[PDB]
UniProtKB/Swiss-Prot annotation:
This is E3 ubiquitin-protein ligase RNF144A. It comes from Homo sapiens (Human). Changing residue 8 to A: Complete loss of ubiquitin ligase activity and auto-ubiquitination. Members of the RBR family are atypical E3 ligases. They interact with the E2 conjugating enzyme UBE2L3 and function like HECT-type E3 enzymes: they bind E2s via the first RING domain, but require an obligate trans-thiolation step during the ubiquitin transfer, requiring a conserved cysteine residue in the second RING domain. Zn(2+) 1 binds at residues 8, 11, 31, 34. Auto-ubiquitinated. Belongs to the RBR family. RNF144 subfamily. A zinc finger (RING-type) spans 8-58. Disulfide bonds: none annotated. E3 ubiquitin-protein ligase which accepts ubiquitin from E2 ubiquitin-conjugating enzymes UBE2L3 and UBE2L6 in the form of a thioester and then directly transfers the ubiquitin to targeted substrates. Mediates the ubiquitination and degradation of the DNA damage kinase PRKDC during DNA damage. Positively regulates DNA virus or exogenous cytosolic DNA-triggered innate immune response by mediating STING1 ubiquitination and increasing its 'Lys-6'-linked ubiquitination and translocation from the endoplasmic reticulum to the Golgi leading to downstream signaling pathways. It is found in: Cell membrane; Cytoplasmic vesicle membrane; Endosome membrane; Endoplasmic reticulum membrane.
Length: 75
């Protein structure tokens, strides 16, 4: 009865699985907001960074795409 679900790490907020999006290699969970404001900034550039998981402490540190991402934001 009642429990701190939690999920995202960039904001350690509280949200279900339908309110989040997977990375693309490590299979992590991050609310669009963060997972977005983070990449949305880089994805737009493309100069470098390769947009890596927002979890510097990720056991897989999976990277993200430049299109697939910008597609979920800058369609
Ligand atoms: Zn978040
Ligand atoms: Zn990760």
């Amino acid at each position: 009865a009642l429990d701190p679900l939690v999920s995202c790490k960039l904001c350690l907020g509280e949200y279900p699985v339908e309110q989040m999006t997977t990375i693309a290699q490590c299979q992590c969970i991050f609310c669009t907001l963060c997972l977005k404001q983070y990449v949305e900034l880089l994805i737009k550039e493309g100069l470098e960074t390769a947009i890596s998981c927002p979890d510097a402490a990720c056991p897989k540190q999976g990277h993200l795409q430049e299109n697939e991402i910008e597609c979920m934001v800058a369609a």
